[PDB]
Design a protein around this motif. Structure first.
Motif, PDB file in Angstrom:
ATOM      1  N   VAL A 148       0.666  -1.366   0.144  1.00 17.38           N
ATOM      2  CA  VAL A 148      -0.004  -0.006  -0.137  1.00 17.38           C
ATOM      3  C   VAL A 148       1.309   1.332   0.115  1.00 17.38           C
ATOM      4  CG1 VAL A 148      -1.762  -0.686   1.237  1.00 17.38           C
ATOM      5  CG2 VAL A 148       0.044  -0.276   2.622  1.00 17.38           C
ATOM      6  N   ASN A 149       2.210   1.320   0.849  1.00 17.45           N
ATOM      7  CA  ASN A 149       2.842   2.290   0.130  1.00 17.45           C
ATOM      8  C   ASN A 149       3.196   2.766  -0.807  1.00 17.45           C
ATOM      9  OD1 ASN A 149       4.679   4.487   1.448  1.00 17.45           O
ATOM     10  ND2 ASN A 149       6.151   2.837   1.568  1.00 17.45           N
ATOM     11  N   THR A 150       3.168   1.445  -2.027  1.00 23.73           N
ATOM     12  CA  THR A 150       4.148   1.233  -3.400  1.00 23.73           C
ATOM     13  C   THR A 150       2.473   2.124  -4.324  1.00 23.73           C
ATOM     14  OG1 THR A 150       5.614   0.031  -2.910  1.00 23.73           O
ATOM     15  CG2 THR A 150       4.814   0.715  -5.375  1.00 23.73           C
ATOM     16  N   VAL A 151       1.770   2.167  -3.426  1.00 20.54           N
ATOM     17  CA  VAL A 151       0.511   2.395  -4.357  1.00 20.54           C
ATOM     18  C   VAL A 151       0.577   3.820  -3.605  1.00 20.54           C
ATOM     19  CG1 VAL A 151      -2.606   1.788  -4.838  1.00 20.54           C
ATOM     20  CG2 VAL A 151      -0.477  -0.457  -4.068  1.00 20.54           C
ATOM     21  N   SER A 152       0.200   3.804  -2.643  1.00 16.17           N
ATOM     22  CA  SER A 152      -0.107   5.330  -2.158  1.00 16.17           C
ATOM     23  C   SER A 152       0.769   5.757  -2.981  1.00 16.17           C
ATOM     24  CB  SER A 152       0.264   5.804  -0.836  1.00 16.17           C
ATOM     25  OG  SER A 152       0.986   5.351  -0.341  1.00 16.17           O
ATOM     26  N   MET A 153       1.908   5.530  -2.964  1.00 18.17           N
ATOM     27  CA  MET A 153       3.297   6.859  -3.318  1.00 18.17           C
ATOM     28  C   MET A 153       3.032   6.446  -5.011  1.00 18.17           C
ATOM     29  SD  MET A 153       6.867   5.368  -2.792  1.00 18.17           S
ATOM     30  CE  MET A 153       8.520   6.789  -3.042  1.00 18.17           C
ATOM     31  N   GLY A 154       2.212   6.051  -5.486  1.00 17.78           N
ATOM     32  CA  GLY A 154       2.485   5.702  -7.347  1.00 17.78           C
ATOM     33  C   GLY A 154       0.504   7.064  -7.540  1.00 17.78           C
ATOM     34  N   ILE A 155       0.390   7.002  -6.910  1.00 13.00           N
ATOM     35  CA  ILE A 155      -0.795   7.633  -6.561  1.00 13.00           C
ATOM     36  C   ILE A 155      -0.678   9.168  -7.115  1.00 13.00           C
ATOM     37  CG2 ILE A 155      -3.534   8.388  -6.001  1.00 13.00           C
ATOM     38  CD1 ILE A 155      -3.791   6.252  -4.346  1.00 13.00           C
ATOM     39  N   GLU A 156      -0.191   9.760  -6.610  1.00 10.94           N
ATOM     40  CA  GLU A 156       0.532  11.230  -7.273  1.00 10.94           C
ATOM     41  C   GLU A 156       0.317  11.495  -8.456  1.00 10.94           C
ATOM     42  OE1 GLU A 156       4.951  11.509  -6.010  1.00 10.94           O
ATOM     43  OE2 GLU A 156       3.746  12.376  -4.657  1.00 10.94           O
ATOM     44  N   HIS A 157      -0.036  11.920  -9.333  1.00 10.23           N
ATOM     45  CA  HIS A 157       0.150  12.821 -10.088  1.00 10.23           C
ATOM     46  C   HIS A 157      -0.026  14.354 -10.354  1.00 10.23           C
ATOM     47  CE1 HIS A 157      -4.203  14.112  -9.774  1.00 10.23           C
ATOM     48  NE2 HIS A 157      -4.346  12.687  -8.633  1.00 10.23           N
ATOM     49  N   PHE A 163      14.880   9.837  -3.317  1.00  4.70           N
ATOM     50  CA  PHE A 163      15.314   8.197  -2.568  1.00  4.70           C
ATOM     51  C   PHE A 163      14.593   7.889  -1.647  1.00  4.70           C
ATOM     52  CE2 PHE A 163      19.857  10.470  -3.641  1.00  4.70           C
ATOM     53  CZ  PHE A 163      19.747   9.020  -4.355  1.00  4.70           C
ATOM     54  N   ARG A 164      12.984   7.904  -1.916  1.00  3.16           N
ATOM     55  CA  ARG A 164      12.306   6.923  -1.000  1.00  3.16           C
ATOM     56  C   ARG A 164      11.881   5.499  -1.656  1.00  3.16           C
ATOM     57  NH1 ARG A 164       8.303  11.157  -0.467  1.00  3.16           N
ATOM     58  NH2 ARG A 164       8.825  12.959   0.707  1.00  3.16           N
ATOM     59  N   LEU A 165      12.079   5.987  -2.958  1.00  4.81           N
ATOM     60  CA  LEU A 165      11.957   5.161  -3.797  1.00  4.81           C
ATOM     61  C   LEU A 165      12.275   3.448  -4.121  1.00  4.81           C
ATOM     62  CD1 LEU A 165      10.581   7.492  -5.668  1.00  4.81           C
ATOM     63  CD2 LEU A 165      10.351   6.103  -7.864  1.00  4.81           C
ATOM     64  N   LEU A 166      13.774   2.986  -3.249  1.00  7.08           N
ATOM     65  CA  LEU A 166      13.727   2.077  -2.606  1.00  7.08           C
ATOM     66  C   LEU A 166      13.192   1.269  -1.937  1.00  7.08           C
ATOM     67  CD1 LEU A 166      16.573   1.028  -3.238  1.00  7.08           C
ATOM     68  CD2 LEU A 166      16.389   3.002  -3.837  1.00  7.08           C
ATOM     69  N   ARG A 167      12.507   1.721  -1.016  1.00 11.13           N
ATOM     70  CA  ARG A 167      10.782   0.574   0.072  1.00 11.13           C
ATOM     71  C   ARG A 167      10.609  -0.865  -1.275  1.00 11.13           C
ATOM     72  NH1 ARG A 167       7.917   5.161   2.668  1.00 11.13           N
ATOM     73  NH2 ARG A 167      10.150   7.376   3.402  1.00 11.13           N
ATOM     74  N   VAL A 168      10.213   0.207  -2.141  1.00  8.61           N
ATOM     75  CA  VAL A 168       9.863  -0.850  -3.500  1.00  8.61           C
ATOM     76  C   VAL A 168      10.892  -2.223  -3.522  1.00  8.61           C
ATOM     77  CG1 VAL A 168       9.020  -1.204  -6.223  1.00  8.61           C
ATOM     78  CG2 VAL A 168       8.537   0.481  -4.792  1.00  8.61           C
ATOM     79  N   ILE A 208       7.025  -0.368 -13.403  1.00  6.23           N
ATOM     80  CA  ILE A 208       6.653   0.328 -12.908  1.00  6.23           C
ATOM     81  C   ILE A 208       7.986   1.053 -11.422  1.00  6.23           C
ATOM     82  CG2 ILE A 208       5.320   0.187 -10.352  1.00  6.23           C
ATOM     83  CD1 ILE A 208       5.238  -2.722 -11.753  1.00  6.23           C
ATOM     84  N   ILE A 209       8.999   0.808 -11.183  1.00  3.08           N
ATOM     85  CA  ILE A 209       9.404   1.827 -10.505  1.00  3.08           C
ATOM     86  C   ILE A 209      10.657   2.798 -11.168  1.00  3.08           C
ATOM     87  CG2 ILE A 209      11.443   0.063 -10.914  1.00  3.08           C
ATOM     88  CD1 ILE A 209      11.231   2.622  -8.059  1.00  3.08           C
ATOM     89  N   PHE A 210      11.021   3.148 -12.240  1.00  2.00           N
ATOM     90  CA  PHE A 210      10.591   3.389 -13.756  1.00  2.00           C
ATOM     91  C   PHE A 210       9.855   4.092 -13.700  1.00  2.00           C
ATOM     92  CE2 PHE A 210      14.993   1.475 -14.253  1.00  2.00           C
ATOM     93  CZ  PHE A 210      16.297   2.128 -14.256  1.00  2.00           C
ATOM     94  N   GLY A 211       8.961   4.142 -13.772  1.00  3.49           N
ATOM     95  CA  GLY A 211       7.947   4.861 -14.310  1.00  3.49           C
ATOM     96  C   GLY A 211       7.624   6.013 -12.639  1.00  3.49           C
ATOM     97  N   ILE A 212       7.636   5.847 -11.655  1.00  2.61           N
ATOM     98  CA  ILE A 212       7.863   6.345 -10.646  1.00  2.61           C
ATOM     99  C   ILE A 212       9.364   7.006 -10.485  1.00  2.61           C
ATOM    100  CG2 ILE A 212       7.279   6.351  -8.088  1.00  2.61           C
ATOM    101  CD1 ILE A 212       6.449   3.059  -8.228  1.00  2.61           C
ATOM    102  N   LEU A 213      10.098   7.152 -10.858  1.00  9.99           N
ATOM    103  CA  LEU A 213      10.983   7.390 -10.986  1.00  9.99           C
ATOM    104  C   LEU A 213      10.288   9.354 -12.389  1.00  9.99           C
ATOM    105  CD1 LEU A 213      14.250   7.593 -10.318  1.00  9.99           C
ATOM    106  CD2 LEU A 213      13.117   5.010 -10.251  1.00  9.99           C
ATOM    107  N   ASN A 249       0.890  11.562 -15.118  1.00  8.05           N
ATOM    108  CA  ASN A 249      -0.015  10.150 -14.224  1.00  8.05           C
ATOM    109  C   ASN A 249       1.148   9.566 -14.018  1.00  8.05           C
ATOM    110  OD1 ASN A 249      -0.883   8.611 -15.626  1.00  8.05           O
ATOM    111  ND2 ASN A 249      -2.443  10.144 -16.127  1.00  8.05           N
ATOM    112  N   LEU A 250       0.817   8.199 -13.678  1.00  8.24           N
ATOM    113  CA  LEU A 250       1.754   6.278 -13.559  1.00  8.24           C
ATOM    114  C   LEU A 250       1.385   6.523 -14.898  1.00  8.24           C
ATOM    115  CD1 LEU A 250       3.577   4.616 -12.364  1.00  8.24           C
ATOM    116  CD2 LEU A 250       1.694   3.787 -11.705  1.00  8.24           C
TER     117      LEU A 250
END
Ligand SMILES: CCCCCCCCCCCCCCCCCC(=O)OC[C@H](COP(=O)(O)OCCN)OC(=O)CCCCCCCCCCCCCCCCC
Ligand SMILES: COCC(=O)O[C@]1(CCN(C)CCCc2nc3ccccc3[nH]2)CCc2cc(F)ccc2[C@H]1C(C)C
Ligand SMILES: CC(C)CCC[C@@H](C)[C@H]1CC[C@H]2[C@@H]3CC=C4C[C@@H](OC(=O)CCC(=O)O)CC[C@]4(C)[C@H]3CC[C@]12C
Ligand SMILES: CC(C)CCC[C@@H](C)[C@H]1CC[C@H]2[C@@H]3CC=C4C[C@@H](OC(=O)CCC(=O)O)CC[C@]4(C)[C@H]3CC[C@]12C
Ligand SMILES: CC(C)CCC[C@@H](C)[C@H]1CC[C@H]2[C@@H]3CC=C4C[C@@H](OC(=O)CCC(=O)O)CC[C@]4(C)[C@H]3CC[C@]12C
Ligand SMILES: CC(C)CCC[C@@H](C)[C@H]1CC[C@H]2[C@@H]3CC=C4C[C@@H](OC(=O)CCC(=O)O)CC[C@]4(C)[C@H]3CC[C@]12C
Ligand SMILES: CC(C)CCC[C@@H](C)[C@H]1CC[C@H]2[C@@H]3CC=C4C[C@@H](OC(=O)CCC(=O)O)CC[C@]4(C)[C@H]3CC[C@]12C
Ligand SMILES: CC(C)CCC[C@@H](C)[C@H]1CC[C@H]2[C@@H]3CC=C4C[C@@H](OC(=O)CCC(=O)O)CC[C@]4(C)[C@H]3CC[C@]12C
Ligand SMILES: *[C@@H]1O[C@H](CO)[C@@H](O)[C@H](O)[C@H]1NC(C)=O
Ligand SMILES: *[C@@H]1O[C@H](CO)[C@@H](O)[C@H](O)[C@H]1NC(C)=O
Ligand SMILES: [Ca+2]
Length: 1135
Positions: A346-355, A427-432, A715-720, A762-763
């Motif tokens: 859910v952390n990854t889902v929420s952190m991906g929601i932002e657009h 750098f928060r994205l490493l939690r994935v 997915i991770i590079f999309g969030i980047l 968006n993502l």
């Protein structure tokens, strides 16, 4: 000797090699700082210091070379000229000496300065892993002579056909009247060009030569239309693409063949030659695609892999406080682990929601939720430090990753002033990445990938060296010579220039990906000379075709009730399915309601559904729906049959319910899509195709984990991408497009605030853009809009933030590596499955191969009829005329004929036609002579049983038929159609085929292809089935998309549209070849001017899925074709 022993100590000292690598790196640095944009005559300091440095280094090179000769000797296997690289180094030394001497002679001659580039090539010999790998590469090179000769074929036949068909045709533009009347102020050019500067020419069709564009299709200018005055068209002007794509000579023809081999600019020249000569030259281009660009470079892959395997085996054969315990139980529960897995998910889902344009409340929600999750992470790591102990906590470094992540997170939380909100959030994205800690199969997959890349690293360094060499060389040749001419008052440098080293390397990398490389090809051929295409040919080959196949070799070797009759009902229903395909092939959205074909289409649908439900009833009453085991639905293909017949029935029902058709239109759409999906039951009705599809499906599970890893990286590079580019993909498109910064300035100019179709708002669109970027097509434009991106709501500037290049290149390298892993995994898995078979049944043929040896024991001597020939005036014909001494003479004659056909070109001198006709007469004469020699050498039996003399007779017979033809036109005996003469002349080329007698390797390789024909043919039938199904889907989905001036088309120009079914087949074929297919998506997804519901519909949710699925499936099918051919080659190699 003693004088030799004086210098042995230093040359054998490894410090000498280390300092030699030091000076090599110094040379790389010195070659780095070259600035061809600014270094005019070296009237600057840094030029002088670099001259001093490379002079000193040349002195070092001279001293080390002379010492290592005088300490090792000269001209001997053990001596200095022992290794190739030592001889190469001597070559650098002598070249540098010559260049220095010439510089003293005050002659620049910047063509020996083209040798400065070759110096970093010295690094291989003194790097052990590089030396070994390159030595294996060079030692396996000589076994590519066969694929090189077959490449000679595929270029030569098609090039001769091209030069004889379209000799100088491409030139002809639509001229004005020969005696034109104009009052004055003549702004009319002699011919017509739609775009300025001949950007998109309008090649006509000559009168008599039936092209398509015959100067009456010109766009009416929008008083008076001056364009209508461009009436007659002749063949005198420059050629398309600044005189780089034409069929004048044979060199340009080979350049065009090279361009279509690499699959770029294909459709452009295809439409050019359609416009010029005839509508039926897509046959030529499709055969060229299938033969060369697929069955050749993939054959090159097969040869590299196989021969590398054998040469590796070769050298292989040469060397051969009480709560602490209590609190542990809660940790290792596998239930709180699942809870924190849900937390991380859910952390990854929420952190991906932002657009883009985040709701104000939503961003506060996200930051609060991030604080909550960070507190939770802090909770379980403060738990783990005490319950386990410090040493135990650090026993796994994954805990160290967690601690680093939480420290960075809390520092970011503290950073509420500035700084932290810029990078620490990124750098928060490493939690994935925490998922690999607990998903176990990926651990095995990742460690396998690491053990593979243990071999890749040396190759990656080799790639860096190779790219560096060609970037420096291109800089030397093309530096400051891409000055693209002005459009608003000053010479704008092209973004794909060579003016500086960063751009040199990124442009060489661009070239290596075979994406918009023809643009710089033309932009280089228009500057220096038409010979500059040799540079791009050499780079393309010595990159993509001999080195990246070496990578694949490295990886693969690193891995190593009622009565029932069923006689021909399957046959008859398969025929009915073929008719169903035929009637599916006509639903293009031009049929006006009430048409006769419309009625026939509907009634055919009715009847075919009736037949399908009838056979449904038959085969179920034979079995029963679910009544016990071995019933109907125990087989998926029968399940598919039932699904499709049921959905067809409900389609018929809803169609009959057309009354009150409001709010069911979406149902109509989904049912149209499903009846387009309908023609698939052939797999059930075809045994070989069914087995092939089962192989496809079963072969996919082994690479399932790799696919999951690639999806995770997407997915991770999309969030980047979301984090970096949010709304910065906006640009003010206008006539000026200058001196303005923000959208307010744009609306002041009132041009437009254009928002790109490929963007990171968006993502989801980030994922689509990343899929395009990873597809090695249209990726340059995305990279450009990334580098130019500045901030949320103002104009991008040229190369604003170059560091995004690192992101954009890392993505390509990582995705290419994962796709390569997928390929090698498929190959090795199929090999293991194959490996069982030759273990199983090939043990039974080795009983018979020696039986065939026993068969040949019968063949010893059946008193062959040589005795009949001698003393019958042919005593030497049977023996002396059948020796190799005269066959090489025939080979030389054929080579002469080849070089003769390599001469025809436009406006060739009259003496040239006379000499060529004389040579043809001589050659057909000698062919008749050798044929007669054979005919008297043996009687009627060898005439047919040889399986070659028939080909010889056909060749000589077509030749003698041809020589009779021009005799008719010398005396004007009878009017002969010029088409007939052209056909005769272009099929004289078939005389080339006789080298296959002498080229035994051609026989071997082509046969090796042939014994794989069953599987690859079944795959080709499946591939055509896939084309058919996706063609029907495309026709029903994108049928209404109109192409006109009001709707600018970037991908589908004239016959690539989705109107009819044939055009849909063509555009799916174009997509399947990775050429401007992203342009086709850019066209298809388009918010129109409300003229039709298709643009305003949910097309955005479906078209990317369409193209993604099609690209993936087509690439997978082709990969399996390649794997089948490779495996057949390995099987033959073992034999
Ligand atoms: C998830 C997406 C992961 C793959 C990324 C897509 C991709 O790599 O496409 C680009 C490549 C074209 O390469 P090129 O011809 O050089 O231009 O195209 C390819 O090389 C794709 C090859 C990888 C095939 C993986 C397909 C997985 C699903 C297959 C279903 C087949 C059903 C029958
Ligand atoms: C998708 O990643 C690349 C890959 O895996 O190559 C393919 C085909 C690609 N190649 C014909 C040309 C290489 C293109 C290339 N150069 C690069 C250099 C640097 C960075 C990126 C680059 N991109 C992909 C799918 C495929 C489909 C087939 F039908 C047959 C073979 C293959 C492989 C094959 C050659 C191993
Ligand atoms: C495997 C290699 C060595 C052979 C490849 C075959 C092509 C070189 C030949 C076979 C059929 C020929 C085509 C037959 C039909 C036409 C239409 C013809 O149109 C008109 O003449 C009018 C132009 C030549 C062309 C394209 C020919 C181009 C050359 C083709 C493709
Ligand atoms: C599996 C998880 C970790 C990755 C995220 C899943 C995405 C594929 C989906 C789930 C939530 C979706 C987002 C939900 C909300 C919106 C707002 C929406 O804007 C509208 O107002 C409509 C734009 C799409 C977007 C970003 C969606 C984009 C696609 C998202 C990110
Ligand atoms: C072995 C093959 C496969 C690759 C070899 C690569 C190079 C050795 C070849 C390929 C491209 C060729 C170049 C193509 C273009 C040019 C530019 C051309 O320069 C000019 O016309 C201007 C001369 C001047 O400015 O005085 C001279 C030939 C040259 C250097 C050619 C030299 C030889 C090159 C570098
Ligand atoms: C997994 C890799 C190999 C490819 C990923 C394919 C799909 C998962 C991606 C590619 C295209 C993306 C779609 C492209 C367009 C949109 C933008 C967005 O649509 C909107 O424009 C919302 C505003 C509106 O149109 O009403 C919703 C996400 C979505 C469907 C994306 C959802 C995710 C998609 C289907
Ligand atoms: C063999 C596979 C791999 C490619 C299919 C080639 C042809 C079957 C396709 C490609 C070009 C298509 C043609 C493109 C142009 C036209 C003109 C247009 O009608 C006018 C639509 C039909 C037709 C003949 C199309 C018919 C089907 C064609 C010949
Ligand atoms: C064997 C299959 C799997 C691949 C090859 C199929 C195509 C080569 C055939 C099958 C369907 C045929 C198409 C069916 C529909 C049309 C009808 C025709 O268009 C019309 O309906 C006429 C318009 C009018 O008269 O007003 C143009 C030819 C074309 C594209 C046909 C061209 C040749 C096609 C594409
Ligand atoms: C654009 O801005 C420049 C800035 O100096 C100015 O000189 C110019 O007049 C402006 N307008 C146009 C059309 O270039
Ligand atoms: C937009 O650009 C103009 C031009 O320099 C500038 O004056 C203005 O402050 C910028 N920002 C706006 C209008 O919000
Ligand atoms: Ca392209």
């Amino acid at each position: 000797t003693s004088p030799r022993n004086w210098c042995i100590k230093m040359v054998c000292n490894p410090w000498f090699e280390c300092v030699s690598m030091l000076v090599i790196l110094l040379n790389c640095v010195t070659l780095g700082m070259y600035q061809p944009c600014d270094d005019m005559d070296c009237l600057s300091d840094r030029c002088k210091i670099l001259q001093v440095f490379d002079d000193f280094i040349f002195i070092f090179f001279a001293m080390e070379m002379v010492l290592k000769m005088v300490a090792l000797g000269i001209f001997g296997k053990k001596c200095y000229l022992g290794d190739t690289w030592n001889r190469l180094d001597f070559f650098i030394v002598m070249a540098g000496m010559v260049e220095y001497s010439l510089d003293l002679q005050n002659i620049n001659l910047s063509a020996i300065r083209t040798v400065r580039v070759l110096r970093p090539l010295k690094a291989i010999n003194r790097v052990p892993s590089m030396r070994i790998l390159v030595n294996l590469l060079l030692d396996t090179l000589p076994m590519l002579g066969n694929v090189l000769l077959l490449c000679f074929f595929v270029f030569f036949i098609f090039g001769i056909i091209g030069v004889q068909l379209w000799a100088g045709l491409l030139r002809n533009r639509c001229f004005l009247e020969e005696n034109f009347t104009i009052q004055g102020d003549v702004a009319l050019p002699p011919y017509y060009q739609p775009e300025e500067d001949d950007e998109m020419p309008f090649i006509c069709s000559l009168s008599g030569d039936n092209g398509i564009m015959g100067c009456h299709e010109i766009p009416p200018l929008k008083c008076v239309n001056w364009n209508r005055y461009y009436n007659v068209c002749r063949t005198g002007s420059a050629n398309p693409h600044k005189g780089a794509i034409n069929f004048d000579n044979i060199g340009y023809a080979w350049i065009v063949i090279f361009q279509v081999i690499t699959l770029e600019g294909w459709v452009e020249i295809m439409y050019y030659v359609m416009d010029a000569h005839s509508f039926y030259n897509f046959i030529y281009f499709i055969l060229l695609i299938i033969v060369g660009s697929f069955f050749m470079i993939n054959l090159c892959l097969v040869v590299i892999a196989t021969q590398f395997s054998e040469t590796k085996q070769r050298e292989h054969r040469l060397m051969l406080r009480e709560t602490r315990a209590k609190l542990r139980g809660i940790v290792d529960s596998k239930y709180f682990n699942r809870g924190i897995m849900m937390a991380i998910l859910v952390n990854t889902v929420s952190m991906g929601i932002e657009h883009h344009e985040q709701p104000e409340e939503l961003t506060n929600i996200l930051e609060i939720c991030n604080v909550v999750f960070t507190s939770m992470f802090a909770l379980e790591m403060i738990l783990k430090l005490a319950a386990f102990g410090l040493f135990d906590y650090l026993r796994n470094p994954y805990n160290i990753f967690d601690s680093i992540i939480v420290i960075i997170s809390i520092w970011e939380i503290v950073g509420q002033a500035d700084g932290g909100l810029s990078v620490l959030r990124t750098f928060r994205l490493l939690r994935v990445l925490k998922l690999v800690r607990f998903m176990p199969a990926l651990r095995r997959q990742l460690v396998v990938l690491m053990k593979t890349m243990d071999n890749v690293a040396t190759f990656c360094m080799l790639l860096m060296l190779f790219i560096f060499i060609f970037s420096i060389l291109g800089m030397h040749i093309f530096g400051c010579k891409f000055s693209l001419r002005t459009d608003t008052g000053d010479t704008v440098p092209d973004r794909k220039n060579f003016d500086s080293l960063l751009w040199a390397i990124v442009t060489v990398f661009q070239i290596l990906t075979q994406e918009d490389w023809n643009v710089v090809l033309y932009n280089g051929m228009a500057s220096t000379s038409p010979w500059a295409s040799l540079y791009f040919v050499a780079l393309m080959t010595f990159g993509n075709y001999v080195l990246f196949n070496l990578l694949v070799a490295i990886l693969v070797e690193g891995f190593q009730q009622t009565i029932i009759a069923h006689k021909l009902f399957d046959y008859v229903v398969l025929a009915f399915i073929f008719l169903n395909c035929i009637t599916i092939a006509l639903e293009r959205p031009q049929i006006e309601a009430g048409s006769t074909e419309r009625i026939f289409l509907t009634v055919s649908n009715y009847i075919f559904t009736a037949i399908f439900v009838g056979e449904m009833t038959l085969k179920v009453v034979s079995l029963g729906l679910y009544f016990g085991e071995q019933a109907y639905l125990r087989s998926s293909w029968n399940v598919l049959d039932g699904f499709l017949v049921f959905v067809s029935i409900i389609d018929i029902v809803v169609s009959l319910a057309s009354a009150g058709g409001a709010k069911i239109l979406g149902v109509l759409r989904v049912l149209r899509l499903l009846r387009t999906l309908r023609p698939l039951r052939v797999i059930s009705r075809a045994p070989g195709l069914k087995l092939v599809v089962e192989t496809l499906i079963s072969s996919l599970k082994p690479i399932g984990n790799i696919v999951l890893i690639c999806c995770a990286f997407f997915i991770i590079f999309g969030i980047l991408g979301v984090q970096l580019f949010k709304g910065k993909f906006y640009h003010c498109l206008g006539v000026d497009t200058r001196n303005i910064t923000n959208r307010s300035d744009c609306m002041a100019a009132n041009y437009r605030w254009v928002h790109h179709k490929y963007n990171f708002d968006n993502l989801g669109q980030a994922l689509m853009s990343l899929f395009v970027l990873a597809s090695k097509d249209g990726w340059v434009n995305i990279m450009y809009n990334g580098l130019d991106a500045v901030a949320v709501d103002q104009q991008p500037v040229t190369n604003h933030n170059p560091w995004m290049l690192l992101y954009f290149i890392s993505f390509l390298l990582i995705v290419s590596f994962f796709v390569l892993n997928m390929f090698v995994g498929v190959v090795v898995e199929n090999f293991h499955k194959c490996r069982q078979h030759q273990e199983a049944e090939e043990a039974r043929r080795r009983e018979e191969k020696r039986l065939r040896r026993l068969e040949k024991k019968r063949r010893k001597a059946q008193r062959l009829p040589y005795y009949a020939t001698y003393c019958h005036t042919r005593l030497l014909i049977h023996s002396m005329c059948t020796s190799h001494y005269l066959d090489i003479f025939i080979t030389f004659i054929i080579c002469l004929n080849v070089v003769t056909m390599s001469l025809e070109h436009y406006n060739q001198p009259t003496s040239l036609e006379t000499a060529l006709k004389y040579c043809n007469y001589m050659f057909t004469t000698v062919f008749v002579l050798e044929a007669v020699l054979k005919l008297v050498a043996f009687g009627l039996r060898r005439f047919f049983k040889d399986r070659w003399n028939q080909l010889d007779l056909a060749i000589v017979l077509l030749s003698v038929m041809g020589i009779t033809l021009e005799e008719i036109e010398i005396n004007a005996a009878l009017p002969i159609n010029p088409t007939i003469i052209r056909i005769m002349r272009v099929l004289r080329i078939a005389r080339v085929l006789k080298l296959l007698k002498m080229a035994t390797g051609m026989r071997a390789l082509l046969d090796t292809v042939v014994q794989a024909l069953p599987q690859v043919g079944n795959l080709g039938l499946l591939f055509m089935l896939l084309f058919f199904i996706y063609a029907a889907l495309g026709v029903e989905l994108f049928g209404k998309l109109v192409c006109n001036d009001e709707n600018p088309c970037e991908g589908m120009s004239r016959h690539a549209t989705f109107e009819n079914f044939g055009m849909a087949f063509l555009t799916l074929f174009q997509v399947s070849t990775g050429d401007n297919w992203n342009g086709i998506m850019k066209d298809t997804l388009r918010d129109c001017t409300h003229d039709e519901r298709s643009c305003l519909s949910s097309l955005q949710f479906v078209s990317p899925l369409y193209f993604v699925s099609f690209v993936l499936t087509a690439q997978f099918v082709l990969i399996n074709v390649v794997v089948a051919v490779l495996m057949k080659h390995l099987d033959d190699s073992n034999k």
